[PDB]
Amino acid sequence: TFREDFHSLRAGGLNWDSLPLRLFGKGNAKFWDPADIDFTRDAEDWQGLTEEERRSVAMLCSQFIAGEEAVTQDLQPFMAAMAAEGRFGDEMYLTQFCFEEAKHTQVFRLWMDAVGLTGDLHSHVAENPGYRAIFYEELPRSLNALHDDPSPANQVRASVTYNHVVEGTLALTGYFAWQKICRSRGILPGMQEVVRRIGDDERRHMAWGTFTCRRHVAADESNWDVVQEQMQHLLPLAVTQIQWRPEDAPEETPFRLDIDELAAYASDRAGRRLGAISAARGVPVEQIDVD
Amino acid sequence: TFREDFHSLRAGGLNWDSLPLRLFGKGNAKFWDPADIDFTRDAEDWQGLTEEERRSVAMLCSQFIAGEEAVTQDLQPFMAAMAAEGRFGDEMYLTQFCFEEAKHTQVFRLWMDAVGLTGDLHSHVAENPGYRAIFYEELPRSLNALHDDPSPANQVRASVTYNHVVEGTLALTGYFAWQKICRSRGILPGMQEVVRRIGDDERRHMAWGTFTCRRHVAADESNWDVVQEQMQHLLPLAVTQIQWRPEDAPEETPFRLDIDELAAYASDRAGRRLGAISAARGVPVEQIDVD
Ligand SMILES: CCCCCCCCCCCCCCCC(=O)O
Ligand SMILES: CCCCCCCCCCCCCCCC(=O)O
Ligand SMILES: [Fe+3]
Ligand SMILES: [Fe+3]
Ligand SMILES: [Mn+3]
Ligand SMILES: [Mn+3]
């Protein structure tokens, strides 16, 4: 009762022109190893930051690494959904995606080790109601709903949560924050490289999510309503996450950052996700999903 | 009800000395891209083979690619089991493992495309009762049993099936067969490279499986009885798979292969798996699993 054929033995083999398999090939060509990045200069720069600056960097790094860990775990029901859909190229892509998230977890962990952020860091994520809502609750709920029901609507809700909010709104805003922190000051060249490489990977993750939502919208435009509903539900939580300040928080945010600017940037990113997905409305599904 | 902390934010971070994380690092250092292998000479060699030789090579290649596809899908419940055990380093490793199997599927598919094996090839696996029993039935049954019950005993049964039989008995015998086919004749240099690279990856897969079984045996030596029972159940099926001949089968196996020699080699590989796992009997678990 488990398997009756193999996609890889069908006539015509695997469709290398499919979006997931093109992304798989790009990810192989662009592979990078966290172990090759030297963090010694970052450790020196870390010592020159003020305490308030270290706290803000630790908070951003903690939000990132916990998020990379979360997606590493929470993507897995999508792999099983693609197995149920019979979509083996998408399943293959998701294996690379998931591994890439484990590798992102690794790289942040190595950076933290290098600068000495080796105590318990949960206070930087667990006290933020927006972060908790997304990464402790909404992300795993939406992705695990695919186990009992891998319907197009649930796939779109899961992809909006994972690819269009967690990645395509929050991670992108985080990369912008890192750029503001590091470029203004010429600090943390290792982290600058991390951000470049993880961002390269993220563009493929986001392309997969855009493809997933587009093909479902093309097949049944009711799924566009689902995309908008899920985004309207989640975006306020993402904005809350960005605007949160700890009890210990300085009146002046370090690095001359404007947290409300970050929130506005995030809203713009979310709008771009919606716009990309909206382009599939009225397109025949076979022109998006060659399969 | 889904997540309450993050392994990556705990004091002491991730334990890079753990076996799974050492393997993860090795896999990153040894990454290879299927797209970098030139199969043009293999295509020329393919044209010089007899029909009977092509049929035998197609059979071996089909058994491999379908097996790579099977493990790509069927490993995934182990990732969820490690999430349940709270074993995040093992989960990270399994993401690389799973991706590597997708990449093995890719490389065989590219080789098949290059030589022109692009029709339906199910006749080469679906008619073999040993192959069917393992790859259609026993592998997915044993691995999916971890969803409702990720107990040590079920983990050992799943790892014996996946790592010690599918990989550590059958794949290793298949690599030996490829070596016999290609080295005796100086043919298929692309496939020779494929076999070297996939074999390198397999040694890490098998090391993970050896570790998994060892730590469970060390914790509860009743799991040694489970290892032996599962191996005694599966090895006859693996031998049947190797000895199978199609209806169309020549009286003389091509390439001067002796199928019963391959079966004996497989039995020796299985014995080596058991011997490796048996070394954990009586070892305190903390000396295997530093965690
Ligand atoms: C100092 C103020 C910082 C404000 C916070 C900016 C938003 C950071 C969000 C990080 C979430 C990380 C998600 C990772 C997901 C992925 O890797 O695929
Ligand atoms: C011409 C006779 C050939 C005899 C068959 C030899 C055995 C081949 C078995 C191949 C199984 C492949 C399993 C792959 C698993 C993995 O990649 O992890
Ligand atoms: Fe991502
Ligand atoms: Fe393997
Ligand atoms: Mn990431
Ligand atoms: Mn393999």
Swiss-Prot record, chains A, B:
Enzyme class name: oxidoreductase
Assigned keywords, A-Z: Iron, Manganese, Metal-binding, Oxidoreductase
Family: Belongs to the ribonucleoside diphosphate reductase small chain family. R2-like ligand binding oxidase subfamily.
Enzyme Commission number: 1.-.-.-
Organism encoding this protein: Saccharopolyspora erythraea (strain ATCC 11635 / DSM 40517 / JCM 4748 / NBRC 13426 / NCIMB 8594 / NRRL 2338)
Cross-link 3-(O4'-tyrosyl)-valine (Val-Tyr): where in chain: V71-Y162
Annotated residues for binding of Fe cation: E101, E167, E202, H205
Gene3D superfamilies: Ribonucleotide Reductase, subunit A (1.10.620.20)
Record protein name field: R2-like ligand binding oxidase
Ligand binding (Mn(2+)): E68, E101, H104
Subunit structure: Homodimer.
Bound cofactor: record note: Binds 1 Fe cation per subunit. Binds 1 manganese ion per subunit. The iron and manganese ions form a dinuclear manganese-iron cluster.
GO molecular function, one term: oxidoreductase activity
Iron recorded as keyword: yes
Source species, domain of life: Bacteria
SUPFAM superfamilies tied to this protein: Ferritin-like
